[PDB]
Paper text:
They are toroids formed by sequential supersecondary structure units of typically 40–50 residues, each consisting of four anti-parallel β-strands. The units are arranged radially, with their strands perpendicular to the plane of the toroid, and have a right-handed twist, hence the name ‘propeller’ for the fold and ‘blades’ for the repetitive units. Since none of our single-bladed PkwA constructs were folded, we turned our attention to another highly symmetric β-propeller of the WD40 family, found in the C-terminal part of Npun_R6612 from the multicellular cyanobacterium Nostoc punctiforme PCC 73102 and referred to henceforth as WRAP (WD40-family Recently Amplified Propeller; ACC84870.1).
As we anticipated from their oligomeric states, the 2-bladed and 4-bladed fragments formed 8-bladed propellers and the 3-bladed fragment a 9-bladed propeller. Instead, the packing of the blades within each fragment preserves the geometry of the 7-bladed parent, and the tension due to the mismatch between the number of blades in the assembly versus that in the parent accumulates at the interface between the fragments. The one formed by two 4-bladed fragments absorbs the tension at only two interfaces, leading to an even more pronounced oval shape and a clear two-fold symmetry. This latter construct, unlike all others, also shows considerable interface variability between the propellers in the asymmetric unit of the crystal, resulting from the two halves being shifted to different extent in the plane of the interface, further highlighting the inherent structural tension.
Numbering used by the authors:
A (entry chain A): 0 to 166
B (entry chain B): 5 to 166
């Protein structure tokens, strides 16, 4: 049971029957495998950059230029808005159980959240915009990638474990 | 920039594309275990097989290399005409998919044989993934599209950004 992340540019649902895509109009669209539109997720007030399905398949996360991450159910309903980043959010990922969300922001931080929208941790250390984030299968360990040309590995108590590329 | 890190199935090994033409294997505590040496240019993408025993690496040298977990080079997959950015294993581990600057995705077996070339993206393909059942392949491109393909290399659908 792996995490799910926006970093590969594809967000299949766990059964592969639904696919989520960031649209060019501040929306996320859900499609079936035949290219038919199922849901438009409306609510972001600026560009949507990253999307992920929870491994539960019931929740979708979207990262936006409007500095928020939004959580949606599969039937298109907005569930939560995760606020706290001070700049664009580029990337979003779910832990393998779907109960933790990680967000990667232009504000140089990764933030970790629960599904009720509560901020759990801020990972600070990157000297530049953080564009990518992903969980380990153990669900304890997090990788982030930044324009500072480094990749950092963290615990979910927010301690830096290693800088894997770069310095 | 593309994503350069992959987890083993249990999370106890982490592969990362290094800035020195190598892949490095780390344990979960950040300790270096192995360096995979052999690519002749930058390494951009890595993946683990579902059994955790094979690692794939995608390189600016236009190849994908397959390695065992103890650091030994198993195969070099040759055929892309430009940088390879991304690499993925199918859920059964028997197929490898590669995403290239040459605007194609290629599908390979573990013995290094080219099975299919997926053409249709109008620009560099940076990301590729299999569906969970392994019957559909998804690719993401600088042409701002995501395309869904079957295993025979037929384009099924394009998500366009509308
Ligand atoms: Zn260096
Ligand atoms: Zn790009
Ligand atoms: Zn449109
Ligand atoms: Zn449009």
């Amino acid at each position: 049971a792996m995490g799910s992340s926006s970093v590969w540019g594809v967000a299949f649902s766990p059964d592969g029957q639904t696919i989520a895509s960031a649209s060019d109009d501040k929306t996320v669209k859900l499609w079936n495998r035949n290219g038919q539109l199922l849901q438009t997720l409306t609510g972001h007030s600026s560009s949507v950059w990253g999307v992920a399905f929870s491994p539960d398949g019931q929740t979708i996360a979207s990262a936006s230029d409007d500095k928020t991450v939004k959580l949606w159910n599969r039937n298109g309903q907005l569930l939560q808005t995760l606020t706290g980043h001070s700049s664009s959010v580029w990337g979003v990922a779910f832990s393998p159980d779907g109960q933790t969300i990680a967000s990667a922001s232009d504000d140089k931080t990764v933030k970790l959240w629960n599904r009720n929208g509560q901020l759990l941790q801020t990972l600070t250390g990157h000297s530049s915009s953080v564009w990518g984030v992903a969980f380990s299968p153990d669900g304890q360990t997090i990788a982030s990638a930044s324009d500072d040309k480094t990749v950092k590995l963290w615990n979910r108590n927010g301690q830096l474990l290693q800088t894997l590329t770069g310095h």
